[PDB]
Symmetry: C3
Subunit: 147 residues, 3 copies
Amino acid sequence: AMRIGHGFDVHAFGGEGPIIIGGVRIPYEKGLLAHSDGDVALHALTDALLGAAALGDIGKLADSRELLREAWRRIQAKGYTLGNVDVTIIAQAPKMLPHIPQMRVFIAEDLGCHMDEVNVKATTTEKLGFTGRGEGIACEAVALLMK
Amino acid sequence: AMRIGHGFDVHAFGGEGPIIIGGVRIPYEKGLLAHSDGDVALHALTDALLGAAALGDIGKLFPDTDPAFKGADSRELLREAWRRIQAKGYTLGNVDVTIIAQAPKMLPHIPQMRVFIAEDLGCHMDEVNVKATTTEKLGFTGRGEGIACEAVALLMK
Amino acid sequence: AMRIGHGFDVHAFGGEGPIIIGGVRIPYEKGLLAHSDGDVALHALTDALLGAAALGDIGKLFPDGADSRELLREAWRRIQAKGYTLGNVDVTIIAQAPKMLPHIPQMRVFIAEDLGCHMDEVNVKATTTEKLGFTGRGEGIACEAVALLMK
Ligand SMILES: Nc1ccn([C@@H]2O[C@H](CO)[C@@H](O)[C@H]2O)c(=O)n1
Ligand SMILES: Nc1ccn([C@@H]2O[C@H](CO)[C@@H](O)[C@H]2O)c(=O)n1
Ligand SMILES: Nc1ccn([C@@H]2O[C@H](CO)[C@@H](O)[C@H]2O)c(=O)n1
Ligand SMILES: [Mg+2]
Ligand SMILES: [Mg+2]
Ligand SMILES: [Mg+2]
Ligand SMILES: [Zn+2]
Ligand SMILES: [Zn+2]
Ligand SMILES: [Zn+2]
């Protein structure tokens, strides 16, 4: 059995930087307003993982990495193993690209998997919408689980 | 043989509520402007499902410039859609649905949604995940201009 | 083992039409401002495919009038080299306009061609955002794609 999952998250820029994406501390003029550390990549990912497992979402269960590992724990308890993941960061800024490998390292660790089972990307919305206006950051993620 | 699908839908708020999301009647100050009942979740879901099956989309099967589908039950679209997917030899792996809305509160309605979705697809509920999020007052959903929904689906032969 | 991938792209309207989507020349009053030919459907799709293969994204490969089909083909060649084969793809075009629907069959033809697959393994769809957001106000076109690879 395979299971597909999908995740989406957003946060608004606010306060002083830096910001935290895919566990990576990323220098930026601006900070992320959130009830948590505001790691949209890790959130989207977690929700994807959980959704695949039909465990709902996060609010159904700070440090985004800890949340991620917790979620993963519960997910594994249901009898699931990791197939692969793919993550898509949506931001006008800052530049994500240099940070992608380290992100991957961290996620790989947190999920107990190999790096080759983790993909992270970035794109801009070319100055369009709320991302485009630099109002915030978004991230989508998808996930494949094996039973 | 397995098959991956993806869907996405949006409606504008307008008129009086309530709204219909995942087949569930949800009280709200505002309604959903649509040709149909505006069930944005079932729509996204339907499109992810037809998408995996290479049958195209909702709109192909059920146009917007057709009087028959005025105020149409999105659950009916869904069942039909599904019928057609089965006829093509497919069976349901799983679905994951993500509702994107500042308001109203989706949380309490999610179980009933799943029941509806499960029944319509002839699956077990554990094959169906529905979640909800907001955009933290960002963009068009954030400003409460409307509701969006994504869905992913996995089919099996 | 199965692999899945997810892709997303966006371009802004600008200059004179037409636009190119899923490799199809589509008439329209406006053009697409892009470093490339601005084919969001193929960029999104390429990213989806690259993602599944854990090859990153378009940018890591081809850092930004490029024929987006050429990119797609090259990407696919690298994916193929890495042991992979095509399961299926599914594309979601997000646009107030122009009308995508009649061009969809030809898109699928192109993509199938480019990927070396049968076209039943390629789905393309289109949706509006009902005048909402940047797509809705006719500021741009967006595309999302998912892909499923086999090893
Ligand atoms: N820009 C767009 C948006 C939508 N469509 C077609 O209209 C139907 C309803 O969204 C959809 O089924 C889709 O086929 C289109 O052709 N072009
Ligand atoms: N429109 C919405 C948006 C969010 N939610 C719930 O609030 C939590 C925050 O994302 C989510 O976990 C979700 O449970 C909701 O019930 N309705
Ligand atoms: N906020 C962002 C957005 C995009 N990017 C990178 O720039 C290239 C444009 O697609 C992409 O290859 C993407 O990796 C980035 O580094 N940071
Ligand atoms: Mg949130
Ligand atoms: Mg629609
Ligand atoms: Mg891009
Ligand atoms: Zn969040
Ligand atoms: Zn709709
Ligand atoms: Zn692009």
